[PDB]
Design a protein around this nucleic acid. Structure first.
Ligand SMILES: Cc1cn([C@H]2C[C@H](O)[C@@H](COP(=O)(O)C(F)(F)P(=O)(O)C(F)(F)P(=O)(O)O)O2)c(=O)[nH]c1=O
Ligand SMILES: [Cl-]
Ligand SMILES: [Cl-]
Ligand SMILES: [Cl-]
Ligand SMILES: [Mg+2]
Ligand SMILES: [Mg+2]
Ligand code: NA
Ligand code: NA
Length: 326
DNA sequence: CCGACAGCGCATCAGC
DNA sequence: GCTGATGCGC
DNA sequence: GTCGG
């Protein structure tokens, strides 16, 4: 919050380059800067001072000047004023609709929530459900509720097979007081890097979670990744709880640490860590951390028996989950 | 300057 | 059907 | 849009 104005401006800038300009790198550039300025322990006094931070170059510097001065950014004003742009920014806020679909729709004349509705016949399933809970999905999830959703989940998993270990990651594992959604990492001893002794392992948990009306809809579902909606039940007369997005990732029980590190993020932290890994001569994904021999190709899995071991490989002092919020 | 910029699962399409 | 690209998402 | 070689 210390530099909220600047970061927000950088965030609006990043959402625009991504949603309208479809310039994925400019989107990321603005995000890094926003992230770097976010954790800066001083109330930035100038664009020249912000530049003293990696990720902030001349361009953002100028804009920070234009912002600190007037109290806003002209480039943005003209963007908030355009219609197609603001309209494309809005449709992307629907789950399943990215910059492409957005622009298309907006070309076809569809440009508002009302338009999306009278045109439901024009959305695939995912976009369909995305519109169904457009509102609900915009709301935060109080941690106290994350705690209740967890119990339903850990307890419905333990009911299918006591050998399943379900871990809530994302912002929750990072100690956040509120979360955007529930991210559940799942592991069963019947599925390792060596073999899938049991199929439907993920389908089993999804079914059981649907059997008890926790999972309400599916956005997409694979052999190892489920994407959907769930709802904490309410007590008598109680108004219903918002509908929430839930993702369940099944990872080989022997690659759990690379998986938990992955699913705890943050996304930018995962980006900076995975980016540093390269500079150090490693490549990190959600399964393992391998080397990058001469040719440049990835070697074989390096032994990992704890999250920290991964931080070690790349010469990085360990960082608590609560400190990976970038 | 200039090329890298993290890494991958599911849906869906093109082309075969 | 298959694979590779592309969209969208985590 | 920024940065490292
Ligand atoms: C986006 C994304 C996710 N993840 C991994 C690392 C991420 O930590 C993890 C969760 O992904 P989400 O549920 O998409 C998330 F980002 F929203 P969150 O971190 O849970 C969150 F706190 F922002 P909230 O949802 O609002 O509570 O997946 C990545 O590695 N890269 C990505 O681009
Ligand atoms: Cl770009
Ligand atoms: Cl691992
Ligand atoms: Cl791998
Ligand atoms: Mg999440
Ligand atoms: Mg999620
Ligand atoms: Na800088
Ligand atoms: Na979207």
């Amino acid at each position: 919050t210390l530099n909220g104005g600047i970061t927000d401006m950088l965030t609006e800038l990043a959402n625009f380059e991504k949603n309208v300009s479809q310039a994925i790198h400019k989107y990321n550039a603005y995000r890094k800067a926003a992230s770097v300025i976010a954790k800066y322990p001083h109330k930035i006094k100038s664009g020249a001072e912000a530049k003293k931070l990696p990720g902030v170059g001349t361009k953002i510097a100028e804009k920070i000047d234009e912002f600190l001065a007037t109290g806003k950014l002209r480039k943005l004003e003209k963007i908030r004023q355009d219609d197609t742009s603001s309209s494309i920014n809005f449709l992307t806020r629907v789950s399943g609709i990215g910059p492409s679909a957005a622009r298309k729709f907006v070309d076809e004349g569809i440009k508002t929530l009302e338009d999306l509705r009278k045109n439901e016949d024009k959305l695939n399933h995912h976009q369909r459900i995305g519109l169904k809970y457009f509102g609900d999905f915009e709301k935060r999830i109080p941690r106290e509720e994350m705690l209740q959703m967890q119990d339903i989940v850990l307890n419905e998993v333990k009911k299918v097979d006591s050998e399943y270990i379900a871990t809530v990651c994302g912002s929750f594992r990072r100690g956040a007081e509120s979360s955007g959604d529930m991210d559940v990492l799942l592991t069963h001893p019947s599925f390792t890097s060596e073999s899938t002794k049991q199929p439907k392992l993920l389908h089993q948990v999804v079914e059981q979670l649907q059997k008890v009306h926790f999972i309400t809809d599916t956005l997409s579902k694979g052999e190892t990744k489920f994407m959907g909606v769930c709802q904490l039940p309410s007590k008598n007369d109680e108004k219903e709880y918002p509908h929430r997005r839930i993702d369940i990732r099944l990872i080989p029980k022997d690659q759990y640490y690379c998986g938990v590190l992955y699913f705890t993020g943050s996304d930018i932290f995962n980006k900076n860590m995975r980016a540093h890994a390269l500079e150090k001569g490693f490549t990190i994904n959600e399964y393992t951390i391998r080397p990058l021999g001469v040719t440049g190709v990835a070697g074989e899995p390096l032994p990992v028996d704890s999250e920290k071991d991964i931080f070690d490989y790349i010469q990085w002092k360990y960082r608590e989950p609560k400190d990976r919020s970038e």
